[PDB]
Amino acid sequence: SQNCHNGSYEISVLMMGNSAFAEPLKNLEDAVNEGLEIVRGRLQNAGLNVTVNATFMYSDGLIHNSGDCRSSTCEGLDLLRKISNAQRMGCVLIGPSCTYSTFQMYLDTELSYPMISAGSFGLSCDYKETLTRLMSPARKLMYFLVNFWKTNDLPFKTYSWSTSYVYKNGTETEDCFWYLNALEASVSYFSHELGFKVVLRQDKEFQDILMDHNRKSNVIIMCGGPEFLYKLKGDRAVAEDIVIILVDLFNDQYFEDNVTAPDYMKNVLVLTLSPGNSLLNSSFSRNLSPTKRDFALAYLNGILLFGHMLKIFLENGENITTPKFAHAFRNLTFEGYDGPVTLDDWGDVDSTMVLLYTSVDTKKYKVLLTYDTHVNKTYPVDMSPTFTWKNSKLPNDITGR
């Protein structure tokens, strides 16, 4: 209750490191600063004469929490590091992780500091009362796959799938690791809704199944880029009835007009997110280019979401130290950088997911179907797709003996 007062609003930004994002925190810092300028502009335009400043709490520590305490001194030292952090902490905490902040989430602070994470894909973060996720959690991906597996009423998808292979070697990116972990976890909705599920841990195991006529499933789920699949598959041919679901949610390359499909991504269905409604425009979007464009984008939208909530609370006329502010980052549509950003009842970013296929006639990536995570509903786009599979239809989950 020191940095969130009358015309003094502070944002605590955690800049960790050696995670998925070890990328120049300068980029991330520039994204936060760009977001602050839009917020300042938005509030001045609303006629609100308030100052919004940001405390960049750089970390790159990944230190073990209070759970492990060798002695009494350990506890006392932990409490002193806590009080210093609590006094400097502001109105909102924008960061990249989930639960090291949860022993200190219950420390008074500002009545469970509203937390906005530009990460936390794991199922362990689901249903948290003060957590907002601005990147598609593994739960939303899982909901799409279960819905798609059950679907048997489409002219191209005439079978309800119940069997699948999940490829995971442990060398994937953080997002991919958590997405495949959610599909691996026995307690997950996907595992409960799957009668046969085997995790392929070796490159050889995947390679051997691509040719094996005695395999238990024709569907293989994997995460990464098309270059990762090419290196993994190699010169090995793929059985005519195999479907490879490539999870690559943060790659807009599939929506570029000059993109031809390789000749390996033919028995491949690509699960990605709807292209950024606007892409390749701003100077800073032109130089920041991997999936980390989306990582940094969440940080920017995090400042905008705070700015939107700060205006609202002040318009109505309440305070921000209230536990209400903290539990008021859900069931809302705010004005993001590239468009409107909708958050569900749990504070997670709703997205439109796109399942892409390689058209045999044009050799181009085409939209097969779309999935709205807000209403948890699938919408078919191409009713007569031109697949490599027999009769231009998706084959059955089991080997057709």
Partner: antibody, heavy 121, light 111 residues
């Protein structure tokens, strides 16, 4: 009133053993970490170790870990220092004390026992 | 262990005098802007009693004539307008890494 009363001190032969007692009065014993601090001429003050009475978690300094043991009797509201294989270097005034954390998070010894002399010869 | 060295070993002064006792640590006893250094007064016969904590904070009931200063490795206990009752054995103590005490300084005198 917060109080710590010590007993068990006296004469011991080299290689012998002695158990010291720190009887406590007027507080919530489980909450505060109990410590043993010795004082010998030309040795100033020396911290032996500690114990959290709530979960019986002990932390004895490396120098005394091999022969000195700290325990508690929750029902008796008392802390104990079991000293084994005693030498002439262990001849000191032994104290039992507790650590208190302030509102600002600072911890230190606040209340001490009257002290009990242990002589090894 | 963090070794604490006091200076002088012993000193003499009269009632009303200003006295200074220094404490040097083998390594920094600081943590998040706070110096985890304490000053204990061991009166003859009695047990150690806290005077100063967190390098400069006066303990409840301790007279204002006692004052603590310093940071990192060097600390100073200042006793202005000495009173006969302030004539014991003074010690410095650190809480940064486990618990260690200084060898002790003795304020023995002429009243």
């Amino acid at each position: 009133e917060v109080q710590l009363v010590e007993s068990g001190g006296g004469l011991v032969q080299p290689g012998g053993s002695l158990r010291l007692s720190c009887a406590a009065s007027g507080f919530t014993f489980s909450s505060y970490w109990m410590h043993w601090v010795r004082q010998a001429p030309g040795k100033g003050l020396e911290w032996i170790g500690e114990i959290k009475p709530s979960n019986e978690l002990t932390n004895v300094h490396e120098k005394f870990k091999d022969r000195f043991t700290i325990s508690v009797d929750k029902a008796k509201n008392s802390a104990y220092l079991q000293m084994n294989s005693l030498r002439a270097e262990d001849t000191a005034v032994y104290y039992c004390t507790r650590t208190i954390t302030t509102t600002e998070g600072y911890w230190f010894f606040d209340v001490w026992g009257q002290g009990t002399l242990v002589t090894v010869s | 262990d963090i070794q604490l060295t006091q200076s002088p070993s012993s000193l003499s002064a009269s009632v009303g005098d200003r006295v200074t006792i220094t404490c040097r640590a083998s390594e920094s006893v600081d943590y998040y802007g706070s110096s985890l250094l304490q000053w204990y007064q061991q009166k003859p016969g009695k047990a150690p009693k806290l005077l100063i904590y967190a390098a400069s904070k006066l303990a409840s009931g301790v007279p204002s004539r006692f004052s603590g200063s310093g940071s990192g490795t060097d600390f100073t206990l200042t006793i202005s307008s000495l009173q006969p009752e302030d004539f014991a054995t003074y010690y410095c103590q650190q809480t940064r890494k486990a618990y260690t005490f200084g060898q002790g300084t003795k304020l023995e005198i002429k009243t």
